[PDB]
Amino acid sequence: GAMLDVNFFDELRIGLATAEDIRQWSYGEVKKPETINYRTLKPEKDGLFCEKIFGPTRDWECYCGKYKRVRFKGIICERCGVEVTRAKVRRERMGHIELAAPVTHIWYFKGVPSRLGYLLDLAPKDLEKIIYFAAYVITSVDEEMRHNELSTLEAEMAVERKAVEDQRDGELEARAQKLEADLAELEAEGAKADARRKVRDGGEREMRQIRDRAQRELDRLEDIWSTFTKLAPKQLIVDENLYRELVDRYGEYFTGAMGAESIQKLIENFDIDAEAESLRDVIRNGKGQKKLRALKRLKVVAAFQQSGNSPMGMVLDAVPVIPPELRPMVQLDGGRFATSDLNDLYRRVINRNNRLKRLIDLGAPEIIVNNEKRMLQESVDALFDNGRRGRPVTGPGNRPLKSLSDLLKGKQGRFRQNLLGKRVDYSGRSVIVVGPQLKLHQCGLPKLMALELFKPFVMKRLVDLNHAQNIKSAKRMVERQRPQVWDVLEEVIAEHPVLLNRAPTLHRLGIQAFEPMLVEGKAIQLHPLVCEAFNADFDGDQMAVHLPLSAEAQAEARILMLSSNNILSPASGRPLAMPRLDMVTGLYYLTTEVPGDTGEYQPASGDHPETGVYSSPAEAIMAADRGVLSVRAKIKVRLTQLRPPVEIEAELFGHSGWQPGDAWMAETTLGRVMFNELLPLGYPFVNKQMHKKVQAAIINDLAERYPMIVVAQTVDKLKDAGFYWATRSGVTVSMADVLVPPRKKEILDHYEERADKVEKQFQRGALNHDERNEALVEIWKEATDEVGQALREHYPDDNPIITIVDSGATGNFTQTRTLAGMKGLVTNPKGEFIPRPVKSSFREGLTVLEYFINTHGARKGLADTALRTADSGYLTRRLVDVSQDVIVREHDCQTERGIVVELAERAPDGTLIRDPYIETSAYARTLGTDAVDEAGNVIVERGQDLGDPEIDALLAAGITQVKVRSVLTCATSTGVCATCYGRSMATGKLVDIGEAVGIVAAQSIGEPGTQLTMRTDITGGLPRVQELFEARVPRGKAPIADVTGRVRLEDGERFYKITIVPDDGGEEVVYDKISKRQRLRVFKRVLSDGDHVEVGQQLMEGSADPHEVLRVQGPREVQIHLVREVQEVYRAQGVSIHDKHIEVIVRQMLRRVTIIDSGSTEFLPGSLIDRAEFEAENRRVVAEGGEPAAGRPVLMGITKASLATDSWLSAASFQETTRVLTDAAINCRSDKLNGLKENVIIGKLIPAGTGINRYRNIAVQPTEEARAAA
């Protein structure tokens, strides 16, 4: 189709190029291994850099300089032949090498499975011998001539064997004559009676060896005859001498050859339709290894049949040559040259081809000619794929050369290094510092970085303000940094957002857009509220700055990704731009209430009134400016501009209407009034002490009930007040604040006696080595807990260490225990505890041996942190690749399917204990059925969002279960709809109709890596998540039951064996080889013999595998199993993901069915096909007959499901590039460029977000009233 590539592509098709294609792309044959002249450094004619083939080196000149302008454009010089045109055509013109002997392509011969071997039915070992000139193959045989001359040739062979045996008879006569002469000359003369038998024994040895020579020659003749009688095509003949005897005696009737020319004659005499028919008869009738082999063969035979490909394109008659400026020869500074490793591979091909032409026209013997052909074949193989077959060709320094397949594969190949991610202009980087004076939408950009990023804008403005005459002098003014430049740079930087990025970008809030303002100095100033999103501290981190240029890109940065528009985390909806660490210490100090503090409320009477009561917070602030009041003393204020809480408002004011200005009397502290003046005006008065959980609940309520601008302004006010009262708060560390518990010696002596008792019991021999370690580990765990409890009781409530932990600001109490207290048990380099603990705190100072023991665990923790970061990155890459085609396409598929969610199971005493994970299961979901009570009135009707008021109404009406819409059961053909997905967690409303919900799901799952540890043979951390998503059979696999019945817990030789006798009277189910390392399953008590089990009951203890839950129980029960088992890994570390981010991934594993019967339509059994087209090829077949295919569900991994995709261009860039490209070409696949990744590679708008036709084709015009009235 298109060849100039003007961007209207519909498809990209890959196939297998034949020799006519190659020598039709070519602009000329290269026939010399020359590159440039060594003296004049200009290209050589017919060489690898030739201008007559590849186009001229200088713009609009020929080679001899005869034609030198655009006036002569498009003509060819009659002397040198160079077409005078642009010099950039040397990146576009290909040439070719015309081979003197055919060569196989290495991709279709070598890599498992051998596609040439499957097509021709030759083993790879028997194919390597042919194409590398080590054996012969019979290309053809003649059956009519053989069948009509078999009798005469048999007569000839019998005649020759008769002659051989008559020769042996003549030898028998001659040696009998010599033997009788020996008899007459030994028996009639006096010698030893044994020595007269030694000569006759030598004669008998001569007879034995001569008849052995005759027997071996007769056996060789029989071998030649049997080989000719059993001659068929595709039959290897090793033993060159046997082949030579065959061509000598029976040189007609057959043909044979070695190498790729014989392979191409076998492909010429190949009947694709007949071979496919016989393979289909085998897969219908036969069974076993024959049927499995025939299925694997029929994949490639049917691929060559059903397309328009011919299999002759797997043998090469011409080799294409890549254009010269994609393998350049550059001249460095200092006259040194650097070249590109493909010129050496191409030069080897040309050198061996030219020498082969010389030998063939010289008439050399076949030893020399075959050695040259084998060398030519190996050089073309090393060009295409170096080191695939044999040792790689190396350059100087034993460095292997970089071939054509190395340009594509790997992390450093084309697809991943240059196409999916690039280096960009208008782009800077510096090191971030804290900017606590900024607002949330602002960043500080150093002026020397901004002057370089905004350079064309300021050059334009300098010319416009007549500071410069033209663009040349304006560029000089910017380069020399004149004083007018800064006055202009403020103007051009005003209201133009920049994107700030901190690597690694783990989720989407790692790129945010800020409105820059110029700072002096050389560091970026980041707002202190976006550090949790970016995961940035200020110990040396660096950020990248990018500049959006067009109107659409500026509008996206200003609307979609401004920093104050993204407060909530898109994974759970919890607020991320929230106060933390110092802003939590300050607000906790401000809002705590201290009894007995200065100027408190006294209720006093008898002599004087109350004296704690204030008429306004202005009067309270004046009294606290004097030394008369504390900010944390309990007073009674009179508030008029703060809304009372719900109970006080209901009691005091009427049907509604606090109505600002109406006075009420509060009983609180002044710091709580000062906190509540930072909240919105209609927000009710809180009167609590501000733990970080309390602040997060307040910010969640504000984000639900108020606009986004109100939420952003409020968190900036909280930032300011928190920092002020943090520095006025009195949190320091000295060594007198690290108190030590006064009972630590008594506790440790009391447990030292118990450890000494266990050690003396080991010394007496009562218990072994390992049980002694177990006793010691339990003793010292109890001692660590008792020391921590005594410490926690000793410390006062206003200690700085306790306050920083207890306010939720940072830290936890085990760090406080190791700092003051006792470090406890430490691990080994393996991971087991060491039975001597660390009994010193870090306040006391560890000893030499305790410090050396503690370093083992410290270093293992650091190394595991590095490895965990790499593994979490790999998992996120696989999850993105599997679920990139789940985007919201619709508003409502109107299905009536849904899932049932659990929602507060019912206590036996009678009440509704709320489910602990109900914020990640039942919130943010659309109801699917009307929720009724006792079939009465509906409470929450169908289509509702299920927030906090709805969940409270359901639990008050006493409903334990609801049916919600899910993406597991969506009816939309492509993508999902917005009602089934539900609320977007980051915006709090229903999801939009272009959202890339699968990218959001993959980053929401994969960002909480690096905090998923195994424990303190069942996998339990990030290796557990990577084997649920990859659908492997687990490490500690526990069996599950198959049918209801009673059990047979047979205890065999030292381990178990379990048999289930079904209640239906069916046959028993036997679980045979069960080791006794795994214990039996406990439920409510351990499984005993003679017990009744259910159909999905897990028998042993361990991990059930997901493939058997799908077979036994169904597709719904593997979705319950896989979602719950992933969340158990995350919930153990206190990480919140909504369930809808795991059901986006799990839905993509169950997209397919496996074929168990072909039916009548093109579906090979055992192949996995999509369920939507399994049923679109069954309604076509239950019409015009009754013969459907039969399919069974499969569960796939995220690697296996994302390589079996319809786009070859997004599967080749995922992984296994060479294997994907070598059967996309055989199947002649076509790529409709529908995906999110294929639009990134080729450079057009992704089909999500603002790049969809609903939004991209908006037509904007002034309205009629505003047009005519201006």
């Binding site: 200088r58 002569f72 001249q331």
Partner: protein
Amino acid sequence: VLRGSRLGAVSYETDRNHDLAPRQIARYRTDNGEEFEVPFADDAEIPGTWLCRNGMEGTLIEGDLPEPKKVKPPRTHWDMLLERRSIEELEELLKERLELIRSRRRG
């Protein structure tokens, strides 16, 4: 900082399309019947043979030129033999070999 040049020039011109020099098209034919068109300049002498895109020379399609002649190899195995032998010596060797094969087969 390394800085290299692939040794060529880049010119700054406006690529127009109208005021261009006239051209004439020749047509050549190789020894397997392929045909190619070459745009030469109008004021230029059209060559007799041209190395085409197959890498094989093609003669001009208009029947005018009796140009190609023999450029024969002066070095074959017969030439190398003749420069060190004589005709009578080779004839004697040939007749001796003929007499040996007569004595072998016939005798």
